[PDB]
Design an enzyme around this catalytic site. Structure first.
Site, PDB file in Angstrom:
ATOM      1  N   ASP A  78      45.364 -37.083  16.765  1.00 44.83           N
ATOM      2  CA  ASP A  78      44.679 -35.871  16.293  1.00 44.83           C
ATOM      3  C   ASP A  78      43.329 -35.692  16.975  1.00 44.83           C
ATOM      4  O   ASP A  78      42.768 -34.610  16.992  1.00 44.83           O
ATOM      5  CB  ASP A  78      44.537 -35.883  14.790  1.00 44.83           C
ATOM      6  CG  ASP A  78      45.878 -35.901  14.104  1.00 44.83           C
ATOM      7  OD1 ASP A  78      46.524 -34.832  14.027  1.00 44.83           O
ATOM      8  OD2 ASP A  78      46.298 -37.004  13.694  1.00 44.83           O
ATOM      9  N   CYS A 110      34.969 -28.339  12.762  1.00 46.05           N
ATOM     10  CA  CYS A 110      35.791 -29.403  13.308  1.00 46.05           C
ATOM     11  C   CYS A 110      35.211 -29.882  14.601  1.00 46.05           C
ATOM     12  O   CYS A 110      34.658 -29.096  15.369  1.00 46.05           O
ATOM     13  CB  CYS A 110      37.176 -28.866  13.558  1.00 46.05           C
ATOM     14  SG  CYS A 110      38.007 -28.409  12.021  1.00 46.05           S
ATOM     15  N   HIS A 128      43.732 -30.337  17.757  1.00 44.70           N
ATOM     16  CA  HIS A 128      44.024 -29.052  17.150  1.00 44.70           C
ATOM     17  C   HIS A 128      43.276 -27.919  17.823  1.00 44.70           C
ATOM     18  O   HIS A 128      43.651 -26.755  17.719  1.00 44.70           O
ATOM     19  CB  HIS A 128      43.676 -29.120  15.701  1.00 44.70           C
ATOM     20  CG  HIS A 128      43.944 -30.463  15.104  1.00 44.70           C
ATOM     21  ND1 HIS A 128      43.340 -31.617  15.570  1.00 44.70           N
ATOM     22  CD2 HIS A 128      44.874 -30.866  14.203  1.00 44.70           C
ATOM     23  CE1 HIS A 128      43.859 -32.663  14.950  1.00 44.70           C
ATOM     24  NE2 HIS A 128      44.773 -32.235  14.094  1.00 44.70           N
TER      25      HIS A 128
HETATM   26  C1  LIG Z   1      37.447 -26.617  11.450  1.00 45.59           C
HETATM   27  C2  LIG Z   1      37.114 -25.620  12.541  1.00 45.59           C
HETATM   28  O1  LIG Z   1      36.214 -25.873  13.330  1.00 45.59           O
HETATM   29  N1  LIG Z   1      37.839 -24.493  12.614  1.00 45.59           N
HETATM   30  C3  LIG Z   1      37.775 -23.517  13.722  1.00 45.59           C
HETATM   31  C4  LIG Z   1      36.868 -22.310  13.475  1.00 45.59           C
HETATM   32  O2  LIG Z   1      37.201 -21.513  12.597  1.00 45.59           O
HETATM   33  N2  LIG Z   1      35.816 -22.126  14.304  1.00 45.59           N
HETATM   34  C5  LIG Z   1      34.798 -21.049  14.157  1.00 45.59           C
HETATM   35  C6  LIG Z   1      34.054 -20.745  15.471  1.00 45.59           C
HETATM   36  C7  LIG Z   1      33.210 -21.886  15.998  1.00 45.59           C
HETATM   37  C8  LIG Z   1      33.229 -22.206  17.356  1.00 45.59           C
HETATM   38  C9  LIG Z   1      32.440 -23.228  17.857  1.00 45.59           C
HETATM   39  C10 LIG Z   1      31.608 -23.928  17.014  1.00 45.59           C
HETATM   40  C11 LIG Z   1      31.583 -23.629  15.667  1.00 45.59           C
HETATM   41  C12 LIG Z   1      32.342 -22.579  15.173  1.00 45.59           C
HETATM   42  C13 LIG Z   1      35.331 -19.739  13.611  1.00 45.59           C
HETATM   43  N3  LIG Z   1      34.732 -19.173  12.424  1.00 45.59           N
HETATM   44  O3  LIG Z   1      36.332 -19.248  14.157  1.00 45.59           O
HETATM   45  C14 LIG Z   1      39.193 -22.962  14.042  1.00 45.59           C
HETATM   46  C15 LIG Z   1      39.156 -22.173  15.354  1.00 45.59           C
HETATM   47  C16 LIG Z   1      40.261 -24.085  14.068  1.00 45.59           C
END
Ligand SMILES: *CC(=O)N[C@H](C(=O)N[C@@H](Cc1ccccc1)C(N)=O)C(C)C
EC number: 3.6.1.15
Length: 213
Positions: free
Chosen positions: A84, A172, A44
């Site tokens: 996934d 994630c 994803h």
């Molecule tokens: C479940 C998940 O990780 N979602 C992502 C997300 O929102 N990421 C963060 C930024 C980030 C980058 C690297 C390490 C940790 C956090 C954000 N608040 O955008 C999504 C991009 C799928």
């Protein structure tokens, strides 16, 4: 102990992002190195990207951003079906200590159920230890996630751990660590979705790693 295994995980955990070769890197989530120049990555993280022509995948391993073109990446499947979480090779990455054997054996899965576990992740820079559990499991289900303006994210995930919990986007790609000390606080899988006080992680077992070399 949980900490000990959390230890191993933190050392192998990187941030994963996407961006143009000379542009701003957009950090999307985490990726976990498992040995050599191979990492686990939730599909994803790049699967809805639009343009692969000029997309590089970025991995932040110790304040340095290593990269590889989506056109040049070697991507390996963990098992059959879905996909996934995949295995990705990044030949220029500073090598990871092999933590493949800390991954739960398929026959040990029932020993993690109905126990709490700890999601070892990162949220932009900041590493966290998020409590979950007791863990349930579903062969197949469709799970809620995060995006609030054009389209939310529900994910049908197969062979997935589900644990009550509160997390944040960016989590994630972090690893789930059993508190069961009888199975050596095994890594159970990778976090892929989080919504409605439920946390979902795809099961990843020791055996899936036989298909890389
Ligand atoms: C479940 C998940 O990780 N979602 C992502 C997300 O929102 N990421 C963060 C930024 C980030 C980058 C690297 C390490 C940790 C956090 C954000 N608040 O955008 C999504 C991009 C799928």
């Amino acid at each position: 102990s949980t900490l000990e295994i959390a230890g191993l995980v933190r050392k192998n955990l990187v941030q994963f992002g996407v961006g143009e070769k000379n542009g701003s890197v957009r950090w999307v989530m985490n990726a976990l190195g498992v040995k050599d120049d191979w990492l686990l990555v939730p599909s994803h993280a790049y699967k809805f990207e639009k343009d692969y022509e000029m997309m590089e995948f970025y991995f932040n391993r110790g304040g340095t951003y290593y990269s590889i073109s989506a056109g040049n990446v070697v991507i390996q499947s963990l098992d059959v079906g879905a996909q996934d979480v995949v295995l990705m090779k990044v030949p220029t990455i500073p090598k990871f200590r092999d933590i493949t054997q800390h991954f739960i054996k398929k026959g040990d899965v029932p020993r993690a159920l109905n126990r709490l576990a700890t999601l070892v992740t990162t949220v932009n820079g900041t590493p966290m230890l998020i409590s979950e559990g007791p863990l349930k499991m579903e062969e197949k289900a469709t799970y809620v996630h995060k995006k609030n303006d054009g389209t939310t994210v529900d994910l049908t995930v197969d062979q997935a751990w589900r644990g009550k919990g509160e997390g944040l986007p960016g989590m994630c790609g972090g690893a789930l660590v059993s508190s069961n000390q009888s199975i050596q606080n095994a890594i159970l899988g990778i976090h892929v979705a989080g919504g409605n006080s439920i946390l979902v992680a795809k099961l990843v077992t020791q055996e899936m790693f036989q298909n890389i070399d």
